[PDB]
Structure formats: C-alpha cells, structure tokens
Enzyme design. Structure first.
Site, PDB file in Angstrom:
ATOM      1  N   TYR A  62      54.934  41.328  41.583  1.00 33.99           N
ATOM      2  CA  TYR A  62      53.894  40.380  41.976  1.00 33.99           C
ATOM      3  C   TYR A  62      53.443  39.527  40.798  1.00 33.99           C
ATOM      4  CZ  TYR A  62      49.143  38.810  43.163  1.00 33.99           C
ATOM      5  OH  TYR A  62      48.005  38.047  43.375  1.00 33.99           O
TER       6      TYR A  62
ATOM      7  N   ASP B 299      39.942  37.562  47.334  1.00 30.02           N
ATOM      8  CA  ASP B 299      40.085  37.063  45.965  1.00 30.02           C
ATOM      9  C   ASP B 299      39.207  35.828  45.824  1.00 30.02           C
ATOM     10  OD1 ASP B 299      40.798  36.124  43.498  1.00 30.02           O
ATOM     11  OD2 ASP B 299      42.965  36.182  43.849  1.00 30.02           O
TER      12      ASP B 299
END
Lengths: 115, 115
Positions: free
Chosen positions: B13, B37
């Site tokens: 990632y 986020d």
C-alpha cells in the site's frame, strides 16, 4: 464529549496507570466498555472484567510519556511509553461515548517493543 | 491472512501511495471496505468510493517511511511519515478480512503533524 475532553481523559488514564490505581482507571470506562490489550487477544467486556484486567498494575509505580496524541471525532490515537529501566512503547486507540467515558481501548504492542 | 501477510500488504500500500497507483491501492481493499481519513471525517464506503478518494491523490510522487509497525490478529497499526519540504507523521490502523484484503483503514493526523 469533545476531542479536548477525550485527550484530557487519556491523560487521566496515563496518570492512574503511572500511580498503579486500577479503581481510578476502571472508573474512566463505560459500563459495557471493551478492552483489547494486546490487539488479537480475547476482548475484556464490561467494567467488572476491565477492573479485573487492571489488577495487573495495582500499586505498581511507573512513569508514562506521551510521544504524540491525536484526538479526532470520538477517538484518540496515542503513541506513548510505559517505564516500569524497562520501557514499552505502545500505540493505543480509545473511543468515547457521548458522556466522555471510554467505550473501547485497543493496544498495539508486543515484546518486540520492550527496551 | 496472517499478520505477516497483512504487514506485507501495508508495505505494498505505502509503495503504491509513493508511486501514485490508485487503482492498485483500491485493489488491496475489500469490495465493501471503509476508509476514514482523517478519523472524524465522513467515511468512504465501498471500493468504488475508495477508488475515487485515492484517484484524487494520484501520480503525485511522494516518499513514505515506516517508523514502527505492529501486526496483531487481523489488524496492523503503523506510525509512518509521508513526505510530499513537507513531511508529516501519521498513525494508521488497517484491519483485514480472511482473504487478506483491507477491510478498514483509519488515519489519525492533523495539520499540526505537518513540519
């Protein structure tokens, strides 16, 4: 509760950890709170089980230090050290109910994080 | 999946983040994954929404560096730096489904963490 409230509650928690005061710690948690310490182990559900869990530090004087703390939404993530010479650096996440008591705690550490 | 594999997925990632490959990032997530986020903001739900969220962020060359990573159970907590003369230190938590795809991501940071 506000993020500032929740940050304050984390500081309380670390105060009572440092003083070895499990009764004070348990009182920060909600009635049906959860503790998962370490993450991956069986969750402790409810204040009775949580108070029993924190018998692991009764009258144990230690020192705690917050390296960084982020209070966001209903959560607080904090990276901190527990010194009992021997030192553990721990990543913890707590979430909070509307009344400001701790709804959940998760602790991310292993013996690899012990110095 | 094992904590080892989940730790590997975190590294995949972070390098897709660094190399600007948002479709490769979305592929790491489960079809009904969530991204929050920063924590406290509206959750992005479903791989379709997650693809849009990262696709906003793509082709930017950045640098990522893990400071500490704890893979426990079906979770990984990691403290890392994102370098865009801008750098910021982020506490992230990912959880993983049985097949190893990312079920959830939460990122704990604010502009205060930018240096």
């Amino acid at each position: 509760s506000t993020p500032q409230d929740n940050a304050n509650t984390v500081h309380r928690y670390l105060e009572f950890v440092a003083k070895g005061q499990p009764d004070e710690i348990a009182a920060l948690y909600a009635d049906d709170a959860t503790v998962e310490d370490p993450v991956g182990s069986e969750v402790h559900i409810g204040r009775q089980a949580i108070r029993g869990f924190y018998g692991n530090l009764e009258n144990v004087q230690s020192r705690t230090e917050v390296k960084t703390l982020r209070a966001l939404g209903h959560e607080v993530a904090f990276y901190w050290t527990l010194s009992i010479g021997m030192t553990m650096d721990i990543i913890s996440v707590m979430t909070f109910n509307d009344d400001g008591r701790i709804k959940s705690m998760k602790a991310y550490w292993t013996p690899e994080n012990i110095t």
